[PDB]
Design an enzyme around this catalytic site. Structure first.
Site, short mmCIF file in Angstrom:
data_model
loop_
_atom_site.label_atom_id
_atom_site.label_comp_id
_atom_site.label_asym_id
_atom_site.label_seq_id
_atom_site.Cartn_x
_atom_site.Cartn_y
_atom_site.Cartn_z
N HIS A 171 1.79 4.43 -2.95
CA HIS A 171 1.82 5.88 -2.85
C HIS A 171 3.06 6.49 -3.48
O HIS A 171 2.98 7.51 -4.17
CB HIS A 171 1.77 6.29 -1.38
CG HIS A 171 0.41 6.24 -0.77
ND1 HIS A 171 0.18 5.72 0.49
CD2 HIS A 171 -0.80 6.64 -1.24
CE1 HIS A 171 -1.11 5.82 0.77
NE2 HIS A 171 -1.72 6.37 -0.26
N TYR A 213 -12.92 1.39 2.05
CA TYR A 213 -11.76 2.16 2.46
C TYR A 213 -11.17 2.92 1.28
O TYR A 213 -10.76 4.07 1.43
CB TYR A 213 -10.73 1.24 3.10
CG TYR A 213 -9.46 1.93 3.52
CD1 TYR A 213 -9.25 2.30 4.84
CD2 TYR A 213 -8.46 2.19 2.61
CE1 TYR A 213 -8.09 2.93 5.23
CE2 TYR A 213 -7.29 2.83 2.98
CZ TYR A 213 -7.11 3.19 4.29
OH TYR A 213 -5.94 3.82 4.66
N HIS A 267 0.83 -1.20 0.00
CA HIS A 267 0.00 0.00 0.00
C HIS A 267 0.86 1.24 0.00
O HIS A 267 0.67 2.15 -0.82
CB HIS A 267 -0.94 -0.02 1.22
CG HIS A 267 -1.67 1.27 1.46
ND1 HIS A 267 -1.08 2.35 2.09
CD2 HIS A 267 -2.94 1.65 1.19
CE1 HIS A 267 -1.96 3.33 2.19
NE2 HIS A 267 -3.10 2.93 1.64
N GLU A 268 1.85 1.29 0.88
CA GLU A 268 2.72 2.45 0.89
C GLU A 268 3.51 2.51 -0.40
O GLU A 268 3.73 3.59 -0.96
CB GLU A 268 3.63 2.42 2.11
CG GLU A 268 2.82 2.48 3.40
CD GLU A 268 1.92 3.70 3.46
OE1 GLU A 268 2.31 4.77 2.95
OE2 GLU A 268 0.80 3.58 4.01
N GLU A 291 -5.56 7.31 -2.01
CA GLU A 291 -5.62 5.96 -1.45
C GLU A 291 -6.22 4.98 -2.44
O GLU A 291 -5.68 3.90 -2.64
CB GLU A 291 -6.39 5.93 -0.13
CG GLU A 291 -5.82 6.79 0.99
CD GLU A 291 -4.33 6.53 1.21
OE1 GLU A 291 -3.91 5.36 1.26
OE2 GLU A 291 -3.59 7.52 1.35
#
Lengths: 61, 699, 529, 529
Positions: free
Chosen positions: B616, B654, B612-613, B661
């Site tokens: 980004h 989410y 997930h990071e 995100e």
């Protein structure tokens, strides 16, 4: 005669196999070791650093 | 006579850790007699059928014949039929050791339920070893007939059979001449007895004394006198400070309310309280109490408020900051308040424990598993019966649990006490004479900060029908552990420089950790990256790694709260701009931060937290390649904002939060290990699927 | 740490006294204390030995080296066990002779290793020459060779060496003296020089069955006929037809095992002639004729009360000795040798040994040794002789006869019968105690016509290449088939045992088989034939 | 903690001076200090020794090795005791001869190990040739062989070597020279080289009784008649019928025990001719004829006041010496050897020894040595000879006669008597001092008819295979049953002891037994027979 056998024995019989590719990494690091460390710090400070490729040096980006 | 007594004397001399001391404690006695047929008043009270006994080999059975026997109950006493040939006659000596080992396991160890599981797995490894030699050596036919593997129920149900197999092994190890025999036929068993009889056995003895309350008081009393001078010299400020330390300090609402006084309070009056994800449940109650008294720009004012309603808890700041007391993570005045108290406390612990009055002392502490890892803590306890622990999840936990560091103030006990429901860890801490520490009148001890601990063993134990994790430990200088972390840093960084093609000396996976679960975190890197590489297209990694290296950004794995590391606070610059969660990405610094200890309320494992990071950062580079001068993201381009307005709500809620995100959720999913998930995102967001393939094309 | 080993023999003390065994763990051999339950399934033998003797047996092989196998690979298997002395026992076997005068009597011979009684430790053998007439017309040797009162005959024999011991010999070859009669030494066989470069492993011949036997006469110039023999001497030979071969114990060097590199080199310091005395004074000797009715001798280490050092050796009971020395086992816990129960054997003792065993049998209150067998203590120097109880023996403890009844059962299996002969299949052991057969014909009214009615005309039984005995009637017949005057006439076949044989013509030169003790062996009528 | 043991002989000082003992502990042997009460019940012997001598005996075996048994297993038991030198003593035994001229006289011989008086440390024997006439017609030795005044006879005898000592010889066998009369050396038997590779253990024969004896004449070509012998010589021999065999002490090498591997190896450095002199110069020598009236020699280490080093040896009283050297014991505290009390023995001393013992009895004020026996100190160089007091002796200390009463008592057990002979049972020792018997019959009126009225015939008593003496008068009765002229006539039998025998015809060639001292031995009437 019994004395001599020992020295020859150690040199030829490598007890374990480091592996196919580990030796390569281990060889280069030992090489750069012999140069005084202080030289390496001077190199990094002026910028670029040495990176070890594996294939034909002729073809790298 | 003189030689016979000396002969016996030599026999008992071989016994390892003087098992007589626990033996006397259970009221056992040793008698040297002749003619055990003709035995003694101490014995003869059990002349019954049980007179048939089986030697190590199982053949003979005669009360008179055999020379060695034990009373077998109620403070049992053993009779050896004293003679003089025991020194040289092994076949005669083995039986002596065989019964002495048998009372220890049947009367001593059984009183504390060990062996439990730790021995069982050895057993399972025996009936499943390649050669069928070893099994034959340590158990009779009754056990041999078992068709399947040995479970804990079987050991608790028979118990006679296990005592038998156990005693034999003990015997074989003590007799010098047979030790070699053991190693050949039961290597693991030899290993077990090898580690058993020379470190834990001393550890085991103390727990036996630990059940007699009188003994516990004696130890406690023996500690008092040592601290009389220090205690008598305690000032009021120290005790007052110490008083605060024991009890968490709660914020008073009346003080905060009187501290705002402006329009924000009126503004706060009519705010949709139950609509902020940033606030936590416990923080809502505080807000709810204030609300009774009293998605826009008002949630930003709530961010400031969050940094002011936290309780005054000294110990808590200490783990969050990892010892870096200068962290500008809180208001300066509060910061000044904290720094003075701890430095003042640091001076209080001026008396060292070191003495000539006592040797190895072990102390205990009950701790909740959820404090170290709520991910493991979530499935640690058997789903059906809370008194048992699932071995499968356990096996992962023990794997790489080898050493730990404590940066905060340990509050330890002296005698074991029953634990609360949520406390499943039972620590056994050895101390060194050099450790600085403080004594408490309430039967607790305060240790100095910055202590290092190496884990010697991880096992399951049984107590009062409930399962626990037994952990031993030895205090050592933190520096000795610190050396391990840097050498670990170099091993991992050198490996990935070759795998990626980066210059040999870059400091990329630098991690600074100061907490209880350190050692597993470090080793867990050697796994997250492996799953990371094998799953993503090779050219993307190199290209993306190049972007990160082109700057000073580094990956940072920590066990302290993200707002306190180094990089995060500096660039944001606002005090209120602090953010904590499972992961975080700093575009400005091009660094990836992974806080191991916390558990994603959504994520299934740690790798996904990373991915997930990872999403980004990668998302930032794609936008960078379009134009160099302008710093911008892939979103804000009219060819993507719209896409979020249509398909944005076809997956998890989410990701629906916002565009930034949103890209990240899909990114893991399109590269998930379960092809079904990949298929899922295809039939749920067909447009995005071709869109994503277009940014990665740029190569 | 000490792991005391006084004898300095590799195996530690405690192990040696109570019992140990080597067992191969996948590929590595180590020494272990005997565990009753785990080794028995693996079929290993439980050893015992002396903690204070570099070689409990006292032979040139250490306790440790022998059982592990780091040792000369020629020692016979059964001697690997530490309590069986391994040493050589050489005697000489002569295969055939030829005669003439300084018309050549060329006869084939058969030899058997002998032992007679107060019997002593010295090897000797005894040959017996067949008396049967290979040639019909060769009646009376005195004339087949033109031998006169003042003539001299020359002797030329062929011999080979047999090693029936338990260890190899290397360099030397034993001296051996020929003797006729009681004390007339005909010759001492020279010690050939630098010629016994071969090896005598146990149960082998030198040279092997595939090579020419060593000609006894040199055929060189050493002596034209070393073995002269006066007329009167020849006469002595004619009445007895027997010779003796006395041999001494002067063997060669010894082959020892060197631990550092595993080379087995013949060391010039150690010589069997210094060792044998040790063995001969410290062991009990057991002689057995079970295998092929040939005397196999083994030596077992027993305790000797008078000597401290000797009391150290593990106690040895007779029962195990037979088990470990010969191959006896316990199929059903009853001692037996290849089926044959122990009870079919005799026990004989030297007068010394006899006295000693009588004591031992008294404190146990027993009369039949077969019961308390496992309770009989061995002392040093008993000499024990175990012989088949069923056979008769002569003065030199050679198998010579048996009860007639036994002979018959050996013949109750007529595989086939015709007018040309019988092809029997007899147990290889009996057919070495039968000197020959008497063939006879019976008139329908009870007359009796014996075909081969001469002392020297019995060798009519050959052996086929498949081990089937074949009797040829046409041999000492007229090369003519078998005639029968009546299909009702009974056909009788007679056998003549060694003990009842004659070796020379009688007083009045009788050649008939009249005064020969004959046991009935066959009687089939004409119809059966 | 070091334990000082200067002599470097394993046993520590205090132990050696005060007393120690070896005792087998289950399977391990350890040395222990003598405890008076706890060792005595097991029948262990209390040893003493010299703390300053590597071998108290001075023989090549250390104090420690002997008692522990670490020693060549051939040394006789009696030499296991620490104070008796173990060394060899070789003499030659000649069994029978044959004669001819450079008609063959073949006689059996009997030899006895001899000892004469100023007696010296050198072995010698004495043969006695049988005198009885084996052949009737062989009257006159001079004629039976066609011997002429200018002829020479050849001698061809058979001999064997006997070891009656206490230690083994290995390679060599001593050279020894035959001598007739006082100084006429007929021949010296060469020492064959590298041929006696066998072993001579004590009380063994070489070659053993089971083998042909070594032919004395070579029978080869070395010398046609090495043993020439002039006429006068042959006559001298007929007059004396007695030879001497003197041997020197050149024995072989010595076998020593090696600690590294427990091998008993023959050392080429040590040679008995260097050891024997010391022993012979530091021990008292005792000769005893108890066993079979044959000279058995033992040596005990005694103190010599004059020598510092020698005072170290334990004081040795006579009684114990006798106890440990021969087998004497004390059932009731009275010294005895298998029944025969000590008082039945003579004590003879060399003049030196006589003086010394007279002193010893003087400082004790005693007259009967048999009482104070255990208070007599033995010194170095004493020589003691103990012979049975009951028998008469000649100059060469051979048993030669006895008092008649013992002789008669030896016959009071007539197991059987018939007209074919007597089957007696006499104590095996007596019938070696009786040359033969003259049987005669007496008419009821005092006449006297001697059956074998020839001196040679006397030898009429043979021995049956069951140890029963058997007299066969048939040989000299011309195969005629004994006749009796009256069932009331008494039959008298006389015995003739060696000392009173004649070896050659008398002055007037008398063949009658007249001038022979005759002892009455039997007298039963005709009806009783």
């Amino acid at each position: 005669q019994e004395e001599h056998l020992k020295e020859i024995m150690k040199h030829i019989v490598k007890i374990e196999v480091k592996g196919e590719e580990a030796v390569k990494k281990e060889a280069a690091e030992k090489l750069l070791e012999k140069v005084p460390s202080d030289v390496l710090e001077m190199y990094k400070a002026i910028g670029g650093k040495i990176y070890i490729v594996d294939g034909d040096i002729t073809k790298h980006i | 006579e003189a030689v016979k007594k000396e002969a016996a004397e030599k026999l008992l001399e071989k016994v390892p850790s003087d098992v007589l001391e626990m033996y006397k404690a259970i009221g056992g006695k040793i008698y040297i007699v002749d003619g055990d047929i003709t035995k003694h008043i101490s014995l003869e009270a059990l002349s019954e059928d049980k007179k048939k006994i089986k030697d190590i080999y199982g053949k003979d059975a005669l009360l008179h014949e055999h020379y060695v026997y034990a009373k077998e109950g109620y403070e049992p006493v053993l009779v050896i039929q004293s003679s003089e040939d025991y020194v040289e006659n092994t076949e005669k000596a083995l039986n002596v050791y065989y019964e002495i080992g048998k009372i220890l396991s049947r009367d001593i160890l059984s009183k504390i339920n060990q062996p439990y599981q730790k021995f069982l797995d050895v057993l399972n490894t025996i009936k499943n070893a390649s050669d069928s030699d070893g099994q034959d050596l340590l158990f009779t036919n009754q056990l041999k007939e078992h068709p399947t593997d040995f479970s804990v129920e079987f050991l608790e149900q028979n118990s006679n059979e296990v005592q038998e197999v156990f005693a034999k092994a003990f015997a074989y190890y003590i007799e010098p001449q047979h030790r070699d025999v053991l190693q050949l036929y039961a290597p693991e068993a030899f290993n077990y007895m090898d580690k058993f009889n020379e470190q834990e056995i001393n550890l085991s003895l103390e727990e036996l004394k630990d059940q007699r309350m009188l003994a516990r008081y004696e130890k406690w009393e023996k500690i008092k006198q040592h601290y009389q001078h220090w205690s008598d010299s305690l000032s009021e400020e120290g005790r007052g400070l110490l008083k605060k330390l024991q009890i968490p300090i709660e914020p008073k609402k009346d003080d905060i309310i009187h501290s705002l006084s402006q329009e924000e309070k009126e503004l706060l009056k009519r705010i949709q309280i139950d609509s902020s994800d940033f606030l936590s449940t416990e923080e809502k109650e505080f807000l709810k109490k204030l609300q009774i008294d009293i998605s826009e720009k008002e949630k930003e004012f709530l961010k400031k408020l969050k940094l002011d309603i936290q309780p005054y808890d000294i110990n808590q700041r200490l783990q969050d900051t990892g010892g870096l007391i200068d962290s500008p993570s809180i208001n300066l005045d509060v910061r000044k308040q904290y720094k003075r108290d701890i430095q003042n406390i640091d001076a209080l612990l001026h008396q060292s424990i070191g003495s000539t009055l006592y040797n190895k002392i072990y102390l205990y502490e009950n701790m909740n598993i959820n404090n170290l890892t709520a991910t493991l803590g979530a499935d640690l306890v058997d789903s059906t019966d809370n008194t048992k622990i699932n071995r499968g999840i356990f096996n992962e936990f023990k794997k790489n649990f080898k050493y730990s560091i404590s940066s905060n103030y340990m509050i330890v006990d002296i005698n074991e006490r029953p634990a609360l429901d949520n406390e499943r860890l039972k620590w056994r801490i050895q101390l060194s004479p050099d450790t600085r520490a403080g004594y408490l009148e309430n039967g607790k001890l305060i240790l100095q900060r910055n202590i290092g601990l190496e884990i010697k063993d991880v096992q399951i134990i049984k107590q009062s029908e409930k399962e626990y994790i037994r952990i031993d430990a030895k205090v050592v200088p933190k520096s000795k552990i610190d050396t391990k972390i840097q050498e670990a840093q170099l091993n991992i960084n050198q490996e990935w420089n070759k795998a990626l093609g980066l210059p040999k000396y870059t400091k990329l996976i630098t991690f600074n950790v100061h907490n209880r679960y350190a050692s597993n975190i470090v080793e867990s890197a050697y796994l997250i990256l492996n799953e990371w590489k094998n799953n993503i297209q090779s050219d993307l990694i190199k290209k993306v790694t190049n972007y990160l290296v082109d700057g000073n950004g580094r990956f940072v794995f920590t066990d302290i709260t993200l707002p306190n590391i180094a990089e995060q606070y500096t660039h944001q610059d606002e005090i209120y701009e602090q953010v904590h969660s499972k992961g975080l990405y700093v575009p400005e610094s091009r660094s990836i931060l992974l806080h191991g200890p916390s558990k994603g309320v959504e994520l299934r494992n740690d790798s996904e937290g990373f991915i997930h990071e990872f999403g980004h950062a990668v998302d930032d580079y794609a936008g960078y390649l379009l134009d160099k001068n302008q710093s911008d993201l892939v979103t804000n381009s009219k060819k993507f904002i719209d896409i979020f307005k249509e398909e944005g709500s076809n997956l998890t809620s989410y990701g629906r939060t916002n565009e930034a995100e949103f890209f990240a959720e899909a990114f893991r999913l399109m590269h998930s290990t379960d092809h079904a998930e990949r298929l899922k995102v295809q039939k749920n967001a067909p447009k995005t699927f071709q869109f994503i393939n277009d940014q990665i094309k740029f190569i | 740490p000490t792991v005391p080993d006084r004898d300095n023999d590799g195996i530690p003390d405690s192990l040696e006294v109570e019992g140990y065994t080597v067992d191969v763990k996948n590929k590595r051999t180590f020494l272990s204390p005997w565990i009753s339950n785990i080794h028995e399934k693996k079929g290993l033998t439980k050893y015992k030995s002396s903690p204070e003797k570099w070689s409990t047996a006292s032979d040139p092989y250490s306790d440790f080296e022998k059982v592990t196998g780091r040792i000369d690979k020629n020692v016979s298997p059964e001697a690997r066990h530490p309590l069986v002395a391994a040493y050589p026992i050489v005697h000489v076997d002569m295969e055939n002779i030829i005669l003439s005068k300084n018309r050549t009597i060329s006869k084939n011979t058969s030899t058997s290793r002998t032992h007679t009684s107060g019997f002593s430790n010295s090897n000797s053998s005894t040959v017996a020459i067949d008396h049967s007439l290979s040639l019909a017309g060769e009646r009376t040797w005195a004339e087949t060779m033109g031998l006169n009162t003042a003539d001299t005959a020359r002797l030329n024999a062929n011999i080979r060496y047999v090693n029936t011991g338990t260890a190899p010999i290397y360099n030397v070859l034993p001296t051996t003296s020929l003797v006729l009669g009681k004390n007339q030494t005909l010759a001492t066989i020279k010690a050939k020089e630098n010629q016994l470069s071969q090896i005598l492993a146990p149960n082998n011949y030198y040279p092997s069955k595939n090579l020419a036997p060593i000609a006894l006469n040199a055929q060189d110039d050493f002596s034209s006929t070393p073995i002269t023999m006066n007329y009167n001497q020849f006469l002595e030979l004619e009445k007895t037809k027997q010779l003796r071969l006395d041999t001494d114990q002067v063997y060669g060097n010894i082959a020892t095992y060197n631990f550092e590199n595993g080379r087995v080199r013949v060391d010039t310091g150690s010589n069997w002639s210094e060792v044998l005395p040790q063995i001969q004074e410290t062991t009990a000797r057991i002689i057995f004729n079970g295998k092929d009715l040939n005397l196999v001798e083994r030596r077992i280490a027993a305790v000797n009360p008078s000597d401290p050092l000797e009391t150290t050796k593990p106690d040895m009971t007779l029962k195990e000795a037979l088990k470990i020395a010969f191959g006896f086992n316990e199929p059903n816990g009853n001692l037996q040798y290849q089926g044959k129960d122990i009870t079919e054997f005799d026990f004989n003792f030297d007068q010394q040994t006899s006295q000693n065993i009588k004591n031992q049998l008294a404190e146990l209150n027993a009369t039949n040794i077969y019961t308390v067998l496992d309770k009989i203590k061995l002392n040093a120097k008993m000499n024990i002789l175990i012989r088949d109880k069923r056979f008769h023996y002569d003065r030199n403890n050679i198998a010579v006869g048996a009860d007639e009844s036994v002979v018959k059962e050996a013949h109750r299996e007529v595989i086939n019968s015709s007018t040309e002969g019988l092809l029997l299949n007899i147990d290889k052991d009996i057919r070495k105690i039968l000197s020959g057969y008497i063939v006879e014909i019976e008139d329908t009214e009870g007359l009796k016509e014996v075909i081969n009615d001469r002392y020297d005309m019995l060798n009519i039984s050959s052996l086929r290449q498949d081990g089937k005995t074949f009797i040829d009637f046409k041999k000492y017949n007229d090369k003519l088939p078998l005639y029968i005057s009546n299909p009702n006439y009974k056909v009788n076949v007679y056998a003549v045992t060694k003990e009842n044989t004659i070796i020379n013509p009688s007083e009045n030169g009788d050649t008939s088989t009249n005064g020969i003790k004959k046991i009935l062996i066959f009687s089939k009528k004409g119809y059966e034939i």
